Amino acid sequence: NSEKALVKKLYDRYSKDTINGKSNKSRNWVYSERPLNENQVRIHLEGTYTVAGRVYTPKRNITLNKEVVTLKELDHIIRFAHISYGLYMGEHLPKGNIVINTKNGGKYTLESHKELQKNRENVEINTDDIKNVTFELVKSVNDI
Ligand SMILES: CC(=O)N[C@@H]1[C@@H](O[C@@H]2O[C@@H](C)[C@@H](O)[C@@H](O)[C@@H]2O)[C@H](O[C@@H]2O[C@H](CO)[C@H](O)[C@H](O[C@]3(C(=O)O)C[C@H](O)[C@@H](NC(C)=O)[C@H]([C@H](O)[C@H](O)CO)O3)[C@H]2O)[C@@H](CO)O[C@@H]1O
């Protein structure tokens, strides 16, 4: 099963709770309502995950330090938060984009069906520039 293997590759990459010395502490890469320090931001994931034509609206957010990070890092943490509601589980690949929206109207688009392209890994992003993350993801079939 090749579709299953492609799913497993995305799951194995993005389910890791560390990257480059950062880690998911206190569920900060999943969901928090805890008060923010002056040096933190909270980026809300606002979107839909539609499975076999039924829309789900999972509520997740990521709590990060204010700093310049790489797109590899932000892509990682964002997809980790998606995995926490069920993204990349089972045997079928999702499709659709996850979009990092910036405060002045910029975007970084993360295509969900494949890994981040290697040539994008080192793009530098100030976490304080991020407005939110939107997404419209589709999994065409349920697992049987
Ligand atoms: C085969 C392959 O992977 N080739 C990639 C390019 O990806 C292909 O071409 C794209 C135009 C698109 O059709 C894609 O589906 C193809 O796989 C890749 O180009 C980037 O691809 C991503 C999506 O995977 C985005 O479309 C990106 O555009 C944007 C973005 O939305 O992310 C536009 C945006 O305005 C811009 N924002 C800023 C602030 O600069 C961002 C940003 O530059 C990047 O996200 C930072 O990485 O890009 C396409 O540029 C291309 C560059 O990675 O490499 C191969 O050619």
Author numbering: 22 to 165
Copied sentences from the primary study:
It has specificity for sLacNac and interacts with myeloid cells in a sialylated glycan-dependent manner to inhibit host defences. Consequently, SElX targets both the adaptive immune system as a SAg and innate immune defences as an SSL.
The crystal structure of SEIX8 was determined in complex with sLeX. The C-terminal domain of SEIX8 (residues N61–I161) adopts the β-grasp fold typical of the classical SAgs and members of the SSL family. Seven residues lining the sides of the depression hydrogen bond directly to sLeX. These are the side-chains of T130, E132, K135, Q138, N140, and R141, and the main chain carbonyl of K128.
